[PDB]
């Protein structure tokens, strides 16, 4: 381990009045920092090199040292928040924005990469990158008639950096920035490169992770049908963020949820709800749960697409984190659904797998299940069939499981189970 002497040599070289020595020193720093295993980032920072690197970004008289310095700083910024902060505090952001206009594509694109790492740190550095004016010149690099005229690597790196400018909350990105970027994201969603598509979906998943107003900005672009197309892709790295975006949109208004339904999303859910990735199954069941939180006509679309048997199957057989989402989908369905819809749900066999989860060691899920049972009894009341329902629940051992909850630590569970027993099993 001789990194400390290498760093000492770099400091000496970088302070040479001979530019060839300075360049060689920056080359050596770039090499150290491009090591896969524990690059010596802190050593380089502690040696006081960041101000030197930032100065070199501006050395138009020596494009190679701009390149080497840009790469070195890219990799420091790829580190911890403290490491990224040292780069920011050194004044790197406006220097990198200036380099976006370099006539040297390899330098411009290295600046793109560094800014992606800086913005990726979080909302504060994201907003600094925006504040210093990065968006316009980034978008200009992408404003060519043919996106295939750009090297695949360059377009991927631009897309990724744009996605980080869309990322994070508290605060969300400035609205005017989102308005600037969104039309480019919509264009990119029709590209054929899978990595571009994946990062563009991630960007859109970020923008839809927020209040209805933000969701509304995305929906109004008309992009939802293309997202639904990507939902059916075979590439997991595309489906994953596409599904997150769609799931985020249906946390919005009934009208926003209708856009997703009208776009044909529900037809994809038999595949998603049975997808061998448990994560896809879970996120798809979460998405379904926010659709069954919708209007009765939206529930009816879920019914009409044959999805209720899929929901019963997930509730019965899936991993517990996915079963939790299925419980929510059921409770939402039963909260908002018509009596007929609820009768159909019971006919599909919801009661036994629902009851079986009352043994779960998750208090919140127990409470959600008891809500669902109460909701189903309310439909039974309108029909004059509360006794038939109570007998069904007894006959599958459901009442034994409800009775058992009178010993539960949680008072709401005790009170809820007691209430059902008093109302319907006394």
């Amino acid at each position: 381990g001789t990194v400390n002497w290498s760093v000492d040599d770099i400091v000496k070289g970088i302070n040479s009045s001979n530019v060839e020595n300075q360049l060689q020193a920056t080359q050596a720093a770039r090499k150290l920092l491009s090591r896969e295993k524990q690059p010596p980032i802190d050593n380089i920072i502690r040696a006081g090199l960041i101000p030197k690197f930032v100065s070199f970004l501006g050395r138009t008289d020596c494009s190679p040292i701009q390149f080497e310095s840009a790469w070195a700083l890219t990799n420091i910024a790829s580190g911890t928040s403290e490491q990224t902060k040292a780069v920011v505090d050194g004044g790197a952001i406006p220097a990198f924005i200036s380099l976006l206009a370099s006539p040297h594509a390899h330098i411009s694109e290295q600046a793109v990469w560094a800014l992606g790492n800086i913005a990726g740190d979080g909302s504060v550095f994201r907003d600094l990158v925006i504040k210093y004016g990065a968006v316009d010149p980034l978008l200009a690099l992408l404003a060519v008639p043919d996106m295939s005229s750009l090297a695949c690597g360059y377009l991927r790196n631009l897309t990724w950096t744009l996605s980080n400018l869309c990322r994070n909350k508290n605060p969300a990105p400035p609205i005017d920035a989102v308005e600037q970027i969104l039309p480019t994201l919509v264009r990119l969603l029709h590209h054929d490169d899978p990595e571009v598509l994946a990062d563009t979906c991630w960007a859109i998943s970020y923008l839809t992770d927020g209040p209805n107003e933000r969701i509304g900005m995305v929906v109004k672009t008309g992009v939802v049908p293309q997202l639904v197309k990507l939902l059916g892709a075979s590439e997991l790295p595309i489906v994953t963020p596409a599904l997150r975006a769609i799931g985020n949109i249906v946390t919005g208004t009934d009208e926003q949820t209708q856009v997703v339904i009208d776009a044909g999303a529900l037809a994809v859910f038999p595949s998603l709800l049975t997808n061998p990735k448990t994560n896809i199954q879970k996120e798809a069941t979460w998405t379904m749960s926010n659709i069954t939180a919708g209007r009765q006509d939206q529930i009816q679309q879920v019914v009409n697409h044959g999805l209720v048997p899929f929901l019963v199957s997930v509730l019965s057989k899936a991993d517990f984190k996915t079963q939790k989402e299925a419980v929510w989908a059921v409770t939402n369905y039963t909260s908002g659904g018509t009596v007929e819809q609820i009768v159909y749900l019971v006919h599909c066999g919801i009661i036994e797998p629902l009851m079986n989860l009352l043994t779960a060691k998750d208090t919140k899920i127990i409470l959600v299940i008891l809500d669902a049972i109460s909701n189903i009894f309310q439909a039974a009341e309108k029909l004059g069939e509360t006794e038939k329902l109570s007998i069904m629940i007894e006959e599958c051992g459901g009442l034994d499981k409800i009775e058992a909850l009178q010993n539960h630590e949680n008072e709401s569970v005790y009170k809820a189970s007691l209430s059902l027993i008093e109302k319907y099993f006394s």
Partner: peptide
């Protein structure tokens, strides 16, 4: 990924 270093192959 959120952040990414540039490395040779």
């Amino acid at each position: 990924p959120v952040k990414k270093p540039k490395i040779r192959r």
